[PDB]
Amino acid sequence: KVFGRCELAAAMKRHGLDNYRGYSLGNWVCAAKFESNFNTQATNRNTDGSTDYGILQINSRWWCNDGRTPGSRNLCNIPCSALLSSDITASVNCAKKIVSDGNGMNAWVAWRNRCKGTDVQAWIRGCRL
């Protein structure tokens, strides 16, 4: 599923991401925009052989199992395929664990490089929430 901007904002808020660990909803929408362009089916291989999955490009090196990332962990206790669902529940639950890991949203390099410090409220501008 390819979400619209406000549609995703609404789903993320519904699933309790809004202000989770102090990160306003616009941060999460901005991260999703640059990680996946709002596409739940997005997958991208990393140079190290891990793969990133879903709207928030969660990495198989630490967080999900894809059966082909040697030496990795599965700290969200899910198959990475679960992270590609049209229903964002698995991605949200796993993102809550990631963002609680110590470095906040810096875990998402695109968030650090493209969202952090910017006017992230623009991402939820005009949305019925």
Q: Which is nearer to Cl ion, 43 or 79 (CB)?
A: 79
13 binds Cl ion (CB under 5 A): no
* Whole-number Cα distances in Å, 37 to 4, 5, 112: 10, 9, 16
Binders in 46-85 for Na ion, by CB under 5 A = 60, 65, 69, 72, 74
36 binds Na ion (CB under 5 A): no
- DSSP characters for 73-127? --TT-SBGGGGGSSS-HHHHHHHHHHHTSSSGGGGSHHHHHHTTTS-GGGGGTT-
Judged by CB under 5 A, the residue of 39, 41, 43, 79 near Cl ion is 79
Q: Which is nearer to Na ion, 34 or 62 (CB)?
A: 62
52 is catalytic: yes
CB atoms within 10 A of CB 37: 11
101 appears as a binding residue in the annotation: yes
7 is catalytic: no
Check residue 6 and report its DSSP letter: H
- DSSP characters for 10-77? HHHHHTT-TTBTTB-HHHHHHHHHHHHTTBTT-EEE-TTS-EEETTTTEETTTT-B-S--TT---TT-
Q: Which is nearer to Na ion, 79 or 127 (CB)?
A: 79
Judged by CB under 5 A, the residue of 46, 48, 73, 100 near Cl ion is 73
Judged by the rule CB under 5 A, the positions of this chain that interact with Cl ion are 5, 11, 24, 26, 65, 67-69, 73-74, 79, 87-88, 104, 120-121
Name the binding residues for substrate.
101
Judged by the rule CB under 5 A, the positions of this chain that interact with Na ion are 60, 65, 69, 72, 74
